[PDB]
CSV table of C-alpha atoms and ligand atoms in Angstrom, one decimal:
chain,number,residue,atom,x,y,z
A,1,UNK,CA,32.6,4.5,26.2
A,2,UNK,CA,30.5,1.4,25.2
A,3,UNK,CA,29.8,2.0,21.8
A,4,UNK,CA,31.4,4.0,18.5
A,5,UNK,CA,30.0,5.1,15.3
A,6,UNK,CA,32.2,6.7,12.3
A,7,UNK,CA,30.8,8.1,9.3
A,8,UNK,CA,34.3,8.0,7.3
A,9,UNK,CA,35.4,9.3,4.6
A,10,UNK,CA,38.7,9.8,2.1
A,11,UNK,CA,39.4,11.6,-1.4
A,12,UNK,CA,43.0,10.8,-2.8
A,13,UNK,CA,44.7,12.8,-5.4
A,14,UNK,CA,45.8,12.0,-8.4
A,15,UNK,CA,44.1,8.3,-8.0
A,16,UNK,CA,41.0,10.6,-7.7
A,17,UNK,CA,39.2,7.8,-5.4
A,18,UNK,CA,36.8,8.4,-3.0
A,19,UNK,CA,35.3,6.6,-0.2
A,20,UNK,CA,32.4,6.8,2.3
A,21,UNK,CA,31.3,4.6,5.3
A,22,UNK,CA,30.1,3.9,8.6
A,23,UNK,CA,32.1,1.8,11.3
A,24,UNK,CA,30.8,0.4,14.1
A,25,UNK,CA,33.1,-0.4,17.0
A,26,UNK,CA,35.6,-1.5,13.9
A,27,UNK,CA,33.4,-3.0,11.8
A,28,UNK,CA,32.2,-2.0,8.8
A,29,UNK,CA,28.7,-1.5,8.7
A,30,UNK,CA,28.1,0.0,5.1
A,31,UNK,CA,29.4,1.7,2.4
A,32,UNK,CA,28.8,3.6,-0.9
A,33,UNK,CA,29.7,2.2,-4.0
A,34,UNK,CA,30.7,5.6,-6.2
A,35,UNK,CA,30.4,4.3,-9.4
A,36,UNK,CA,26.9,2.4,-9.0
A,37,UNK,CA,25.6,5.0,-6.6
A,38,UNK,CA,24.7,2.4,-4.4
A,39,UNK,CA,24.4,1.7,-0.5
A,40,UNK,CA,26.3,-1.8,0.2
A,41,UNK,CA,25.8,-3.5,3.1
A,42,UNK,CA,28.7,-5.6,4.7
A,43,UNK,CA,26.0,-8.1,6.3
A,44,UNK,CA,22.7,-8.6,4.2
A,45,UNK,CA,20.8,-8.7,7.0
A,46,UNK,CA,21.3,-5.2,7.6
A,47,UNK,CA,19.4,-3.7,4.7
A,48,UNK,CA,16.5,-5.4,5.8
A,49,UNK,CA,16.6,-2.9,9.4
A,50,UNK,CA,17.9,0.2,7.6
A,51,UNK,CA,18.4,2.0,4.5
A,52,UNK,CA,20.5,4.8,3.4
A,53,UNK,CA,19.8,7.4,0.6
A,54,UNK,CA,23.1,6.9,-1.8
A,55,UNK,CA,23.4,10.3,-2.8
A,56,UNK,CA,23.6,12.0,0.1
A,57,UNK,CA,27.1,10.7,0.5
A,58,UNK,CA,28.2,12.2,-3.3
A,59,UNK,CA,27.7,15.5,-2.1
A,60,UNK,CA,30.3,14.8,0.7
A,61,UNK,CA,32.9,13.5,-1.5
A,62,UNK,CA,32.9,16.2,-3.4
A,63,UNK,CA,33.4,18.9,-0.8
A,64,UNK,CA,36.2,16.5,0.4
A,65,UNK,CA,37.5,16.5,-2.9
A,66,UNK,CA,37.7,20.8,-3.3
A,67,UNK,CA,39.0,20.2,0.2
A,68,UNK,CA,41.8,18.4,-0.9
A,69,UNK,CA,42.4,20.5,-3.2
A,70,UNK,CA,42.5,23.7,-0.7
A,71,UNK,CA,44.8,21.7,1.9
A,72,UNK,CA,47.3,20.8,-0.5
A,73,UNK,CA,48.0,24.6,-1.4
A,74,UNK,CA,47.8,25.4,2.3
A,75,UNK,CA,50.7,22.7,2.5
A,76,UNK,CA,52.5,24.3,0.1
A,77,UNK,CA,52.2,20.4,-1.8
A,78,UNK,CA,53.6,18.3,1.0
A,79,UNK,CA,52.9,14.5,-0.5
A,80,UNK,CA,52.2,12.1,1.7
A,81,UNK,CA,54.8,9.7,3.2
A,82,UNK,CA,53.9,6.0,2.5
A,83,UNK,CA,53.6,3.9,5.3
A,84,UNK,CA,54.1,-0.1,4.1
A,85,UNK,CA,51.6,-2.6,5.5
A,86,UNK,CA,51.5,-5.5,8.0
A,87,UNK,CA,50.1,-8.7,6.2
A,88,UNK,CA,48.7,-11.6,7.7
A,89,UNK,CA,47.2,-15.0,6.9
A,90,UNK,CA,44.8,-16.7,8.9
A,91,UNK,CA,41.7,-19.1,8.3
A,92,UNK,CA,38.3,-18.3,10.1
A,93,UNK,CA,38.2,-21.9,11.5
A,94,UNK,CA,40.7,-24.6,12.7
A,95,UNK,CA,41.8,-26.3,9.4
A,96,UNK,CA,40.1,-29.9,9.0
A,97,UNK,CA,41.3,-31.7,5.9
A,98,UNK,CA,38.5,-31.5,3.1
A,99,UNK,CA,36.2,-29.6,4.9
A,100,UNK,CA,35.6,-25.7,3.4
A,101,UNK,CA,37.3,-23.1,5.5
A,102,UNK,CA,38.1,-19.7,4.2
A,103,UNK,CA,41.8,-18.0,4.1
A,104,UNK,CA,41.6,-14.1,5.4
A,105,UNK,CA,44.6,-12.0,4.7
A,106,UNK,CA,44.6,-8.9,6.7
A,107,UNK,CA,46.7,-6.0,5.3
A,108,UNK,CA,47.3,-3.5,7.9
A,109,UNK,CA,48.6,-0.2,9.4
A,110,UNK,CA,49.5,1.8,5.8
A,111,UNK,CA,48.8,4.5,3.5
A,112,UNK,CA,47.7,5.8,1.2
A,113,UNK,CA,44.8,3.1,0.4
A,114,UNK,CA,46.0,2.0,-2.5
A,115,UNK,CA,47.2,-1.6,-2.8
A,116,UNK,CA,47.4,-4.8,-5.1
A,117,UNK,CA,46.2,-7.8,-3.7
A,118,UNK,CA,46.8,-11.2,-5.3
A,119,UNK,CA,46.1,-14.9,-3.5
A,120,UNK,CA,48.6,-17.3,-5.1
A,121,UNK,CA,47.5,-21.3,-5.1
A,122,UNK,CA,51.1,-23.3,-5.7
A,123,UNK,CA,52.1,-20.2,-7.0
A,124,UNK,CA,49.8,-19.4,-9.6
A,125,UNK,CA,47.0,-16.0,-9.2
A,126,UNK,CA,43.5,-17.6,-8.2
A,127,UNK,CA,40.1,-15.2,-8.2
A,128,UNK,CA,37.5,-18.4,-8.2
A,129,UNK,CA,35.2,-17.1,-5.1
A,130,UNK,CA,37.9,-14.3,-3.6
A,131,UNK,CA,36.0,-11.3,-2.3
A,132,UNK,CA,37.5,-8.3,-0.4
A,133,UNK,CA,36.3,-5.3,1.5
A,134,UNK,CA,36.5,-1.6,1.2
A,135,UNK,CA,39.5,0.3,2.9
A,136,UNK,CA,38.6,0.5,6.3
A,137,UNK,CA,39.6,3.5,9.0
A,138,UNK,CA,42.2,3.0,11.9
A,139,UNK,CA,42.0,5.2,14.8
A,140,UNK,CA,45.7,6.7,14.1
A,141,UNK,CA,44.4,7.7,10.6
A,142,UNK,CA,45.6,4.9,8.6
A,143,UNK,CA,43.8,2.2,6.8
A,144,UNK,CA,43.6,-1.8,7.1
A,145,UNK,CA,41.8,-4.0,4.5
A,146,UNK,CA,40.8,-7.9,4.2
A,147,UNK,CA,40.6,-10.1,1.3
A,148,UNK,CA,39.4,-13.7,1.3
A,149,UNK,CA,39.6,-17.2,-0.4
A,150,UNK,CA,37.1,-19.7,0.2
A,151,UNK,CA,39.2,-23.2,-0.2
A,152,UNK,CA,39.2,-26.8,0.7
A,153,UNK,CA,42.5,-27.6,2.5
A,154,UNK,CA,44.4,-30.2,1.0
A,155,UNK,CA,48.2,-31.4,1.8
A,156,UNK,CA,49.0,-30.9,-2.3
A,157,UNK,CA,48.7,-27.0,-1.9
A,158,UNK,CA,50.3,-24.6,-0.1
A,159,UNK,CA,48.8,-20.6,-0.5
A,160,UNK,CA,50.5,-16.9,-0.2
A,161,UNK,CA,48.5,-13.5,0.0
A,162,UNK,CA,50.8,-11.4,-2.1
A,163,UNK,CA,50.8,-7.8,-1.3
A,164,UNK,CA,52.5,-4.9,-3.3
A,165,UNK,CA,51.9,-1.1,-1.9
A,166,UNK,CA,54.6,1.5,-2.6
A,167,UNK,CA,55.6,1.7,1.1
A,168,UNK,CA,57.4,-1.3,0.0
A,169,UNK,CA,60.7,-2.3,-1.8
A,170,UNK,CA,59.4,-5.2,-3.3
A,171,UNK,CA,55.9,-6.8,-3.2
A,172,UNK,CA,55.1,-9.0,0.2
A,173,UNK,CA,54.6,-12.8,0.2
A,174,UNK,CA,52.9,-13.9,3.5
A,175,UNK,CA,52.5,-17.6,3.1
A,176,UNK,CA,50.2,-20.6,4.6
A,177,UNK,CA,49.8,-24.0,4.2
A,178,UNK,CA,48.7,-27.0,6.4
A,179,UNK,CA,50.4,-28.0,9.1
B,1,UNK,CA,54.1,5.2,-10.5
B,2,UNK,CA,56.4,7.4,-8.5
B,3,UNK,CA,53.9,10.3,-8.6
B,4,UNK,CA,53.3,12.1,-4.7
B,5,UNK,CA,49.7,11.1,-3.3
B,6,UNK,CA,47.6,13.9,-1.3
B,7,UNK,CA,45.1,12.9,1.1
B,8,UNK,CA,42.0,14.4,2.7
B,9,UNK,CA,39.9,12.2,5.4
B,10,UNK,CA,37.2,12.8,7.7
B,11,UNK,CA,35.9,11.7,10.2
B,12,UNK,CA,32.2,12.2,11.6
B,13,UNK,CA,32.0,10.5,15.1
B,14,UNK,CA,29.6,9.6,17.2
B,15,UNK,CA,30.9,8.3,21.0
B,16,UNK,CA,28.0,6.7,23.1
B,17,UNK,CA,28.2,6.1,26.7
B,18,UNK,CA,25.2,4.1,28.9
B,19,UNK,CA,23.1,4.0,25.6
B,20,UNK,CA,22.1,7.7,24.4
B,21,UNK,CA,22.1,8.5,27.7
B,22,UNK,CA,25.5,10.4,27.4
B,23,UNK,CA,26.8,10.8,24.1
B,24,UNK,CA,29.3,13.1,22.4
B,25,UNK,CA,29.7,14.2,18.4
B,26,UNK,CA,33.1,14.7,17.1
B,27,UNK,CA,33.6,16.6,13.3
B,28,UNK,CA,37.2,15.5,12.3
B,29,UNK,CA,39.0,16.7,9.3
B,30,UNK,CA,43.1,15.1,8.0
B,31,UNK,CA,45.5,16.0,5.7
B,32,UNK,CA,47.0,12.8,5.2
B,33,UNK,CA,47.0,11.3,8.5
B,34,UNK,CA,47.3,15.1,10.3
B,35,UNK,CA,44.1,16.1,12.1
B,36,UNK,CA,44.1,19.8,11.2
B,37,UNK,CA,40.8,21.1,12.5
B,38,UNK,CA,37.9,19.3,14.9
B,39,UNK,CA,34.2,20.2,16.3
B,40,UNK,CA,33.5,18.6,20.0
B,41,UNK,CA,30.2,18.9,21.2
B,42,UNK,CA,31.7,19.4,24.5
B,43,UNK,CA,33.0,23.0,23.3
B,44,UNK,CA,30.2,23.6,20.4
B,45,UNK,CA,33.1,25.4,18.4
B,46,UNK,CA,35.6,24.2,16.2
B,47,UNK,CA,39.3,24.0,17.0
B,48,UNK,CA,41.9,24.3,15.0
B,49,UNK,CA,44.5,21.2,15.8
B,50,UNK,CA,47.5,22.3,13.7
B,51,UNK,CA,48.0,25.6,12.1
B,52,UNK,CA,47.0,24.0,8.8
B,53,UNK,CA,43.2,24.3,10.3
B,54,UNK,CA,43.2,28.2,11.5
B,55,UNK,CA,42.1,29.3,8.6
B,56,UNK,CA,38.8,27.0,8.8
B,57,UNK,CA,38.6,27.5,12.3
B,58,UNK,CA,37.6,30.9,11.9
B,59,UNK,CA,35.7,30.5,9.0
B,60,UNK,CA,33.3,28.1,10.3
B,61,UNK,CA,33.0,29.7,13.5
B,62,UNK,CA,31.5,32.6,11.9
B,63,UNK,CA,28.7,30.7,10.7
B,64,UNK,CA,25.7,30.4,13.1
B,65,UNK,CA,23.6,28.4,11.1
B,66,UNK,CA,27.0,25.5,10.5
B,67,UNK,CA,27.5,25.9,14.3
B,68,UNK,CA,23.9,24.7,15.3
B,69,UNK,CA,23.7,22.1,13.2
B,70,UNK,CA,27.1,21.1,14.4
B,71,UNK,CA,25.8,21.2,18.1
B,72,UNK,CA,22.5,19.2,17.4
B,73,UNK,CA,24.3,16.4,16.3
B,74,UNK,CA,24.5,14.4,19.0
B,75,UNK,CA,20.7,14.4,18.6
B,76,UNK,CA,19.7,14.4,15.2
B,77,UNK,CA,22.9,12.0,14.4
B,78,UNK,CA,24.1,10.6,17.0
B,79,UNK,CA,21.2,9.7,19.0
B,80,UNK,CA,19.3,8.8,15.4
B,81,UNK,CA,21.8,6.8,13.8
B,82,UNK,CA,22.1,4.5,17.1
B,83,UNK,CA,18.4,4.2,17.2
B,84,UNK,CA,18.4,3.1,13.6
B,85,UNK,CA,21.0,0.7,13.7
B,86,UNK,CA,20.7,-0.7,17.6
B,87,UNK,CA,19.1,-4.0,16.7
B,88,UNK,CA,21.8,-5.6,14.7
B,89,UNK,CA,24.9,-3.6,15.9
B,90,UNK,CA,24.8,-3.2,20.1
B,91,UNK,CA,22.7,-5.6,20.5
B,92,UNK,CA,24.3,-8.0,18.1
B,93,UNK,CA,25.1,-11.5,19.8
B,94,UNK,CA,26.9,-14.2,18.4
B,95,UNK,CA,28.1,-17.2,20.0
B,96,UNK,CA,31.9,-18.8,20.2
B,97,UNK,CA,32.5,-22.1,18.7
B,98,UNK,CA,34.9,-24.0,21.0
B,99,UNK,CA,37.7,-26.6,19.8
B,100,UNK,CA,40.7,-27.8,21.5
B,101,UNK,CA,43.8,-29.5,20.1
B,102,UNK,CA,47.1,-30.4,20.3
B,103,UNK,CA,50.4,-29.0,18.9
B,104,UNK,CA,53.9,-28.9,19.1
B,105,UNK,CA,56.0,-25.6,20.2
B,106,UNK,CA,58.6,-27.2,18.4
B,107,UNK,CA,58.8,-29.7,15.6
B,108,UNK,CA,60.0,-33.0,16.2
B,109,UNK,CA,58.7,-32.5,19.5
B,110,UNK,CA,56.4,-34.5,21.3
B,111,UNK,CA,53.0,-32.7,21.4
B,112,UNK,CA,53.0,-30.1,24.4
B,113,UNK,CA,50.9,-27.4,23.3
B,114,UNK,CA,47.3,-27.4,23.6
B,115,UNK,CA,45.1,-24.9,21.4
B,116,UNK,CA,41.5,-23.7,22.6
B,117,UNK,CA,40.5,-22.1,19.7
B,118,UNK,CA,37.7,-19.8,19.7
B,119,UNK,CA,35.9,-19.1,16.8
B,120,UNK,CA,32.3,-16.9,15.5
B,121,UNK,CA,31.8,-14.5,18.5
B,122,UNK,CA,30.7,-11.2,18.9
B,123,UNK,CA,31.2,-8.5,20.5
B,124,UNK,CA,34.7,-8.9,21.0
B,125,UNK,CA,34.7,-8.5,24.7
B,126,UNK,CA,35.9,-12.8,26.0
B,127,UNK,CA,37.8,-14.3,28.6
B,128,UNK,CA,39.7,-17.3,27.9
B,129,UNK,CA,40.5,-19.8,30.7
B,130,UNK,CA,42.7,-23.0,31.4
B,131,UNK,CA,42.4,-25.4,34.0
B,132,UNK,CA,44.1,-28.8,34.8
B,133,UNK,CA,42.2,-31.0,37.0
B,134,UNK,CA,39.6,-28.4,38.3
B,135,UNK,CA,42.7,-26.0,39.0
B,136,UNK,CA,43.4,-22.6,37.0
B,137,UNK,CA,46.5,-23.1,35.3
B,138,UNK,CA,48.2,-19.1,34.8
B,139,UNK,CA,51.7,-20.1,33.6
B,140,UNK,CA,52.9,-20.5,29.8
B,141,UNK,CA,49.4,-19.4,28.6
B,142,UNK,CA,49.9,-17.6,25.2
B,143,UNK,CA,47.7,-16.2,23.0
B,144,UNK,CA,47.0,-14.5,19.2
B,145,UNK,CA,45.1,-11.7,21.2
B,146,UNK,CA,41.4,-10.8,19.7
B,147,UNK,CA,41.2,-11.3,16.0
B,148,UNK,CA,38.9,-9.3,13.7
B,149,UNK,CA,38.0,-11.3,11.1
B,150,UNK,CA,36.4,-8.4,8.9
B,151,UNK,CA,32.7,-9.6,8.8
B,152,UNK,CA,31.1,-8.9,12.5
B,153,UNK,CA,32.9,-12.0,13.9
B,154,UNK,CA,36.1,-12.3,15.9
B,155,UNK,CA,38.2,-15.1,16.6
B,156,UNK,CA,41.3,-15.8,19.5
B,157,UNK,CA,43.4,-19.0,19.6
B,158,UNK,CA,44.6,-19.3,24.1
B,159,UNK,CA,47.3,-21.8,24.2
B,160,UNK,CA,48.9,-23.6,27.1
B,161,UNK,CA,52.1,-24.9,27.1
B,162,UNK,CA,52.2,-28.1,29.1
B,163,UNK,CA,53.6,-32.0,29.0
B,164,UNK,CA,50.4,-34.1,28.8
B,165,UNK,CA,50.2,-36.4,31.1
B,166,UNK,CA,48.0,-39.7,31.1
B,167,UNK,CA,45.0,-39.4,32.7
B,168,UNK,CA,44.7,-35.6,33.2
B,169,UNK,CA,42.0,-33.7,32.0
B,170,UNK,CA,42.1,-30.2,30.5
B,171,UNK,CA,39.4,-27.6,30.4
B,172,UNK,CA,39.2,-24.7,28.4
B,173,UNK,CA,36.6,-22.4,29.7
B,174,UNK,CA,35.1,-19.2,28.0
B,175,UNK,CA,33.0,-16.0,29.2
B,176,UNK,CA,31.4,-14.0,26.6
B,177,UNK,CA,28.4,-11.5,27.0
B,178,UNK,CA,26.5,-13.8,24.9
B,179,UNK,CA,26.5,-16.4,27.2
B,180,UNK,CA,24.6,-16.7,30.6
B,181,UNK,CA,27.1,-19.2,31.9
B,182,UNK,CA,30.8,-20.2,30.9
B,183,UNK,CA,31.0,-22.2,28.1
B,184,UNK,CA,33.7,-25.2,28.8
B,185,UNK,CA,35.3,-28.0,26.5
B,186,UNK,CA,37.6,-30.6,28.1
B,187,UNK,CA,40.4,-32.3,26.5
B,188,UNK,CA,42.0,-36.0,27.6
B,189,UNK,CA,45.5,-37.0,27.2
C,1,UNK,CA,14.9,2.8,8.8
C,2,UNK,CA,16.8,5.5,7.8
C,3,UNK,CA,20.4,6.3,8.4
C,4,UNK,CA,21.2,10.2,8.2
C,5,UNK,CA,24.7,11.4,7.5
C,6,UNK,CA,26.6,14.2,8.9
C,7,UNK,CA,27.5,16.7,6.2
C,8,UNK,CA,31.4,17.8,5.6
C,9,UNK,CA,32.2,21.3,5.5
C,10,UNK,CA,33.7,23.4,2.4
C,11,UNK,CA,36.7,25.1,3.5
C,12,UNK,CA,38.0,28.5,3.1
C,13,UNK,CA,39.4,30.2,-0.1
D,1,LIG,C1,54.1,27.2,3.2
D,1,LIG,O1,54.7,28.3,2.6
D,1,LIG,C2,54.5,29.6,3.2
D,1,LIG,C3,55.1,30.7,2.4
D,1,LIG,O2,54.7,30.6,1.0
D,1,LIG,C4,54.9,29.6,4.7
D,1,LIG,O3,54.6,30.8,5.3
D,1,LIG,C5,54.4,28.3,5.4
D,1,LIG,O4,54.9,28.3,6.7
D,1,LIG,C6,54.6,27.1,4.6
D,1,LIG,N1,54.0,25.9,5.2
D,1,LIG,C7,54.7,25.0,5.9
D,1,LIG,C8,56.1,25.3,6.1
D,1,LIG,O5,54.1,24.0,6.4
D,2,LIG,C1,49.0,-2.0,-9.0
D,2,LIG,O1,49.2,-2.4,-10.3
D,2,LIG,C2,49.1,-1.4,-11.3
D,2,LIG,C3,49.3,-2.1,-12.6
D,2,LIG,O2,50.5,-2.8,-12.7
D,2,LIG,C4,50.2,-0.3,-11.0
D,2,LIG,O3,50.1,0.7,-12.0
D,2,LIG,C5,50.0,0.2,-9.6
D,2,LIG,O4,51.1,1.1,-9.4
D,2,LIG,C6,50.0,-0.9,-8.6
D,2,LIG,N1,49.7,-0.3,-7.3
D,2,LIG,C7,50.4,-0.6,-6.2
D,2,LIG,C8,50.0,0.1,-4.9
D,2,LIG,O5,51.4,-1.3,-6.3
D,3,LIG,C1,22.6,4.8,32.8
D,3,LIG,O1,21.3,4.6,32.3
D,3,LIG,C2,20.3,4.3,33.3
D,3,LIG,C3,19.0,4.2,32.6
D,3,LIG,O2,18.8,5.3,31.7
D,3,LIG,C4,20.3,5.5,34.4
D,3,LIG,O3,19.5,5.0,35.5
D,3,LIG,C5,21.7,5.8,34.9
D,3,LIG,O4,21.6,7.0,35.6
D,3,LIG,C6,22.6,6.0,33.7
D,3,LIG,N1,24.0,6.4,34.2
D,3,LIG,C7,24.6,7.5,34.0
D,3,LIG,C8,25.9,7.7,34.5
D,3,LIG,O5,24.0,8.5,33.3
């Protein structure tokens, strides 16, 4: 095939969280923002070519929601088994001192999508400029997520993406620094 | 919070193949990560996958109305959605920034890596060459693989493992369906 | 334009 769209979805009991969005080829094209009822674009740019009506995707959640609740009877209640994450830290660009770059972490191949994500700057929680995206589909049904921190490398600090999910035994340190 | 999670996923997919020219719908439902029950526009039924999904099988097969607008899909989804979103998805183009530098394999080592770092593209489709003195080099080339970076760009370090010597030149070259012609950087010891 | 969505299906009982 040459190209693939998804129109995703996922309800998740008790968190009650829902989530709806389109992939494209693995990228996230949009999503609905539940609380707002609003359409959010991953790229601006895209909004300016298309639009999509909000609501529409409401409507699906809750049918996946009574779903839920019909499957999990059927199952006789069978919780699902957690499945810990792989974490990575990368930048976007090779690392020149004092020029901006941006730190990704990419947490990967788990479930359920639910996870805390902290960056850590010499140890301590930062949030100046971090952004993230929504939980994002795999093609064997589990989920994969990025978070980001713009920064201006420096040989005085060193960074960790900090992960905790409860697939794990104890939350997950993946560490970078120059050099 | 030790309380057991329940999930429910689906899964609405639309599979293109030579544009619209082929193209097939597929109506996925999960329990957890289980698919229990599917609609494939190549059968224009649902299917249950596990037991789980007989029940819903049945039931939605038994409604026309649900069937047909199951079976237009690939038309009045499918074919739509791709027309809606072709400019800035399929035919998205962005072009590879191109560094190359040294490194070390090991620390204390002298330098005897050398990094062509590829940076920006899309799609992810790339091919990543060395050469030494005009000459493909094959051996102890390494690589992260093809890197998602999350926001419509991807992203691949190709390294060669090699002893530098004076005088030799390296090239890194790069294919990419943006490009009309490879895209090389050389590097001098 | 616009983007249409596929709609998900009630289940039984
Ligand atoms: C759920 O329980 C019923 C009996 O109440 C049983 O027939 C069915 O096989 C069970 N589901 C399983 C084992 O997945
Ligand atoms: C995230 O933190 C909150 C507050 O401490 C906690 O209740 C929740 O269990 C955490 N979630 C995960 C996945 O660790
Ligand atoms: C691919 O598309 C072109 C143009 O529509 C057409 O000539 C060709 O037959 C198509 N290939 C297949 C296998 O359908």
């Amino acid at each position: 095939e040459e190209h693939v769209i998804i129109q995703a979805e996922f309800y998740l009991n008790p968190d009650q969280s829902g989530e709806f969005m389109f992939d494209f080829d693995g990228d996230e094209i949009f999503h609905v923002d539940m609380a707002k009822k609003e359409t959010v674009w991953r790229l601006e740019e895209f909004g300016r070519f298309a639009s999509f009506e909000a609501q529409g995707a409401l409507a699906n959640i809750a049918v996946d929601k009574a779903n839920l609740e019909i499957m999990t009877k059927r199952s006789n209640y069978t919780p699902i088994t957690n499945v810990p994450p792989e974490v990575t830290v990368l930048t976007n660009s090779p690392v020149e001192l004092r020029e901006p770059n941006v730190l990704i972490c990419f947490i990967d191949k788990f479930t359920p999508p639910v996870v805390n994500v902290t960056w850590l700057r010499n140890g301590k929680p930062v949030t100046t400029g971090v952004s993230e995206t929504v939980f994002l589909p795999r093609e064997d049904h589990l989920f994969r997520k990025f978070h980001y921190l713009p920064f201006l490398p420096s040989t005085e600090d060193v960074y960790d993406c900090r992960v905790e999910h409860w697939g794990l035994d104890e939350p997950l340190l993946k560490h970078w620094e120059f050099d | 919070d030790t309380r057991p999670r329940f999930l429910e996923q689906v899964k609405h997919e639309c599979h293109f193949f030579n544009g619209t020219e082929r193209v097939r719908f597929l109506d996925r439902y999960f329990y957890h990560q289980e698919e229990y029950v599917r609609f494939d526009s190549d059968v224009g039924e649902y299917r249950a996958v596990t037991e789980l999904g007989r029940p819903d099988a049945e039931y939605w097969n038994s409604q026309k109305d649900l069937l047909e607008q199951k079976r237009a899909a690939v038309d009045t989804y499918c074919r739509h959605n791709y027309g809606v979103g072709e400019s800035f998805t399929v035919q998205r183009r962005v072009y590879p920034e191109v560094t190359v530098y040294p490194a070390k394999t090991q620390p204390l080592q002298h330098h005897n890596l050398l990094v062509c770092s590829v940076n920006g593209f899309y799609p992810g489709s790339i091919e990543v060459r060395w050469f030494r003195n005009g000459q493909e080099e094959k051996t102890g080339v390494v690589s992260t693989g093809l890197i998602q970076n999350g926001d419509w760009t991807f992203q691949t370090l190709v390294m060669l493992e090699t002893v530098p010597r004076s005088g030799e030149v390296y090239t890194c070259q790069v294919e990419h369906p943006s490009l009309t012609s490879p895209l090389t950087v050389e590097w001098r010891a | 334009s616009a983007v249409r969505l596929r709609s998900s299906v009630p289940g039984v009982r």
